[PDB]
Amino acid sequence: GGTDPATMVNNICTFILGPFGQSLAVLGIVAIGISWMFGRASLGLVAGVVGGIVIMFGASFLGKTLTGG
Amino acid sequence: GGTDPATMVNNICTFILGPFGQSLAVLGIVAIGISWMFGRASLGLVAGVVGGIVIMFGASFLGKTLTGG
Amino acid sequence: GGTDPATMVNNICTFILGPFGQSLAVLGIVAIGISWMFGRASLGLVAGVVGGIVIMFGASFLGKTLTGG
Amino acid sequence: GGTDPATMVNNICTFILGPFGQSLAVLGIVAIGISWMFGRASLGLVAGVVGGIVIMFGASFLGKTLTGG
Amino acid sequence: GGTDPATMVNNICTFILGPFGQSLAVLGIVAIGISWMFGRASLGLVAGVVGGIVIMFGASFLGKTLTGG
Amino acid sequence: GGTDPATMVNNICTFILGPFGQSLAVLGIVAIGISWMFGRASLGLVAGVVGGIVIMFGASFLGKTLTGG
Amino acid sequence: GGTDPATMVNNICTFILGPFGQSLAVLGIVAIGISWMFGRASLGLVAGVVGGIVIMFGASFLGKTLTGG
Amino acid sequence: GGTDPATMVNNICTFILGPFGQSLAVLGIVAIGISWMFGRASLGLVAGVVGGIVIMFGASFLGKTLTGG
Amino acid sequence: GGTDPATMVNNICTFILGPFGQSLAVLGIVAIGISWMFGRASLGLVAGVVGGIVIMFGASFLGKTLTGG
Amino acid sequence: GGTDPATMVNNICTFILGPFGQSLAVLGIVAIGISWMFGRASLGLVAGVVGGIVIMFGASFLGKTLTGG
Amino acid sequence: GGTDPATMVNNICTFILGPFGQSLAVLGIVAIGISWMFGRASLGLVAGVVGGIVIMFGASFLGKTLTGG
Amino acid sequence: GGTDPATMVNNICTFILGPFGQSLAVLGIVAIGISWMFGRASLGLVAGVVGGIVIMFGASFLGKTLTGG
Amino acid sequence: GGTDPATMVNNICTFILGPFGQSLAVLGIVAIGISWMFGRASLGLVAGVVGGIVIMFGASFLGKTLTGG
Amino acid sequence: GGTDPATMVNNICTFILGPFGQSLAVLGIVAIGISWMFGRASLGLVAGVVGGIVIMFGASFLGKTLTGG
Amino acid sequence: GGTDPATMVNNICTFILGPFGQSLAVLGIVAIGISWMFGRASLGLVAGVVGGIVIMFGASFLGKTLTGG
Amino acid sequence: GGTDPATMVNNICTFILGPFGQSLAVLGIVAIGISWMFGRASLGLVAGVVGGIVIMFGASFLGKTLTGG
Amino acid sequence: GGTDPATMVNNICTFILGPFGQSLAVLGIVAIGISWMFGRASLGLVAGVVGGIVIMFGASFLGKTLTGG
Amino acid sequence: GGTDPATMVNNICTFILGPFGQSLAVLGIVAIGISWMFGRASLGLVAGVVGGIVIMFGASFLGKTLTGG
Amino acid sequence: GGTDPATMVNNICTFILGPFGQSLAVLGIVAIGISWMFGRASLGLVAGVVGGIVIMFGASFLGKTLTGG
Amino acid sequence: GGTDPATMVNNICTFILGPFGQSLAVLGIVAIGISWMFGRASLGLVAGVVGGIVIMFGASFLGKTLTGG
Numbered sequence A, B, C, D, E, F, G, H, I, J, K, L, M, N, O, P, Q, R, S, T: 001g002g003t004d005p006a007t008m009v010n011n012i013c014t015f016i017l018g019p020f021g022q023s024l025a026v027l028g029i030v031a032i033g034i035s036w037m038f039g040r041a042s043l044g045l046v047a048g049v050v051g052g053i054v055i056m057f058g059a060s061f062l063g064k065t066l067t068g069g
Ligand SMILES: CCCCCCCCCCCCCC(=O)O[C@@H](COC(=O)CCCCCCCCCC)COP(=O)(O)OCCN
Pocket: C043, C044, C045, C047, C048, C050, C051, C052, C055, C062, C066, D041, D042, D043, D046, D047, D050, D051, D054, L027, L030, L031, L034, L035, L038, L039
């Protein structure tokens, strides 16, 4: 009978922000560690990646506040 | 039948943080030693590389704490 | 469900200023000691490193005062 | 029914200049402290970062004055 | 009955140069502040962004003068 | 599974302050002896090197006291 | 059929720490001797190069201890 | 009568990982040597190329482990 | 009738490592000599170039050992 | 019909090591003389430049011996 | 077919420690003699240069003993 | 309706040369004092900084005179 | 009815070289003053910026002379 | 009745090389001046732009000579 | 809502010249005492450091007088 | 009656490798000279261009050897 | 009727190496003089620029010799 | 109708070597005087700057002689 | 309409050699007096500074005579 | 048509060793005289400068003998 998109998109968000996003952020941190190992350590890389993680896990509240509710 | 990404990404993390990351850090230390041999010894290089190794092997707990759980 | 960045950034600050920053400052002092052992002892190095440590552990109050509250 | 951008952009500014910018400036100060610890202490780094913080928290009045009102 | 484009384009200009452009310039200044915080402070970035703001808010007079009237 | 940096940095400190720092200080004393043999004996060299050794082996308590705890 | 990286990286480490690293350290010592011949003899150069050699040949145990095992 | 793709793709993998991949890796090493000869020697190039070779010859086990079997 | 790539790539390697690579290394040594003549003599340049030559002429054995055979 | 690179690179080497390299070394010696005239006379400059000249004119035999033939 | 670096680096060491290093040490002694002729005779210069020569010609045994074998 | 850049740039100049430049020069003087406290007192630093302040507060008349009006 | 580009480009030049370029040069001088305040005073910066200003305000005569009329 | 392209293309060339190209070159010089004001002064920019102007105003003779007449 | 830089820079000055600068000057005096203890007592060091302290605590009035108000 | 492509492609090769390629290489050398005049002299540019010329004039023998005949 | 490229490319070379290259080299020498006036005098700049001029005016003979005729 | 570059480059040279280069050299001499006033007087600075001026005003004859005519 | 650089550079020279250079020389003399007060009186300092002043105020005639007119 | 570098470099050498080097050595002798007038007379300065002059005017024979012909 199909389901309304208000539940399918919410399922997508719950999946991408549940246990999957945790391991994705872990992989991001592993990536910045490896990039510091072989090369140069610059604050820009860590700042950008930590900001990306914050934006990923703040998407809910960022969307709630940016749209006035 | 395929497997859910919650296990595949975890397998990736376990591989990259198991016996492989050990030898990768060993190669990083060999690299900083060689860079000190032919050239100048600066605290910046060792600080950056040791920090990269710490970030690589702290990725799990860093991810657990940075996301509030 | 995600967490608001006002808590994630605070967690980052608490981690980087808790038991980790203590050992990081200890490593900085070990570094200045080693740099005095093999080489020349200059007030500039110790002044800069102690100032860096003070700025690291004063970041909270420095931010509170520099922004007028 | 949607909201006019004159309120959404203002919400963005209020969020980025409220409790979030405080901790962001705190992280910037932690960064300059860490950069002074492992390396050399130069007035350029602190000048640039403090100027960045001032520009971030002066954005409102800087915009009001630069546009003649 | 529709409206002539001489009023619709003027409405677009008035909207984009009224209260919206103010907050947009505020966001630009916040952006340059954040870019100075985590990274390097270069006169090029501030020069370019302030020039962009000037060109945005000078568009009316720039258009009046560049076309001889 | 990785380890939290609060243990890795502590391991670094324990290694650099255990049996390794002893022989490093021994090498420093050998160095000042050799520098006195072929050349001039100045109180500045011995003062600086002994101060470096004290700072290396006082790093723990110096860090505990400089940070108020 | 290919080989798992846990053996290839180990082969790299064994090669770089076997008979090759010996002659590389010999070349480093020849380099510091030549640098002392034509120029000035400073404890900093020898300290840095011997430390680089120690870090190169201690990479295995340094990696074992820095990672808690 | 044709053959099932489960054998054709396996033939492709066996060819690309047999005696051909050996000489391809040899060419990669020749390339990094030539790039070090005329230019600057950076750890990034060698790290990237050796990692590419490891990924090429670890493709089998990497695929076996990343897919949980 | 064409030839299998296992012979063409081998021909490429034999050409690039035969009499051509000798004169290429000779040109590299001429280059480092000229760079020492007009400018400053740094161990880094010679170390990097000699390492590049070694990697070029060790490509065969490096490939044989890095791949476990 | 073109010529094989084994002759073109050899022509390059013969040109750069024939009558041209002689006058280039003469210019290098003129340079070190001028640098001693207006400034300070340090053994490092002459050592580096004479070593550069030796490496330039020893490139042939250095290449023959460094490659085992 | 190329040669393994274990022989090329050994060839480098044999060349730099054979008949070439003898004349290089002779030039070093000529240098210290000339520096004593026009100027002041200090034990530091001779000590440093003789130590450099000893380190150059002791590189083999110094490397054998410093690495425990 | 926007404002002509002849007023916006003038507003920028008035802001940067009004009460803000005073405190900026005060910070510059504090900086040179701190640099004299921990380190060496050289006329070059004070000369450069006082010249920078003079150029900052002479920008108006310097621009008027350098352009012939 | 539109205007010929020979007048529009001339209007652009007159605007960019009239009262706007004056304040732009004033901002450039403020910039070099600020760069001298927090940092090092080098003749290169002032030379480059004054040359840029001269080229900006000499564009007319430079164009007249470079094109033979 | 239309005109032959041998006159229309010539009209295009005369327009683009008459009074219009003069002011275009003036704008180019203003551009290089502004680029030197806010940023770094490099010979490459001025060389490229002056070469572009020369090529623009030499197009006639360059075309006459490149085509043998 | 942010604060105007005329108050933030003033807060910076008040902090750096309040109770913090007192203890900083105390540390400077301790430094000159320690430098006199182990070494030679020269009027230059004390003159420079006392002048640095005077410039630090005279920054306000020095700025008021150097700028004509 | 047309000609077989085995002669037309050979004519193309003979033209592009006859008297035309000579002047093309001459233009390439003029280009690298001009690029060294206005800018920085880097071994990479000359190495790349000389390698391009060698590959252009070695195309015949490179094709003969790469294809096993 | 068109002309064969063997004459057009030769015309290009004759133009770029005739009276134009003379004044281009004159401009290069003016450039190195100006770069020595405002800044530091380094042998590298003059060496690179004179080498660029030599390569520009040696392009003919360099091409004749590098291609074996 | 455009002008041939043989006249435009000559105009550039005449401008840069006419009354402009005189005042540029005057500014260079003022610069070396100011650098001697606040700082240390070293023969290297004056030698380099006078050599730069000589090279600037000798560019014509230097170009005539370096190119054999 | 802009002004030719022959007047702008002359304005720069007139400003830097008018009433400004007088007070700059006065500051230089104050500097040498202060340097004699706290420290040692050496003829080298006064000779260098008076020579710097002479070169600053002789720049015009020095430029006129050094260039043959 | 260009000239071969074997004549251009020879022209450079003839110019730098003809009537120009004579006056350059005269300036060097004037420099050592002035340095003896205001300051201390040390054999090191005269030895170094006379050696620089000898090396400048012996460059031809030094190059002929150092290269075995
Ligand atoms: C647009 C706004 C600009 C604001 C800038 C004001 C900054 C003033 C600080 C002057 C710093 C000067 C740099 C310097 O020179 O290093 C000095 C520092 O040491 C100290 O005192 C360290 C203690 C300072 C702690 C102060 C805390 C500020 C927090 C500010 C939020 C050591 O000498 P190092 O020996 O220099 O010698 C190496 C040669 N390179």
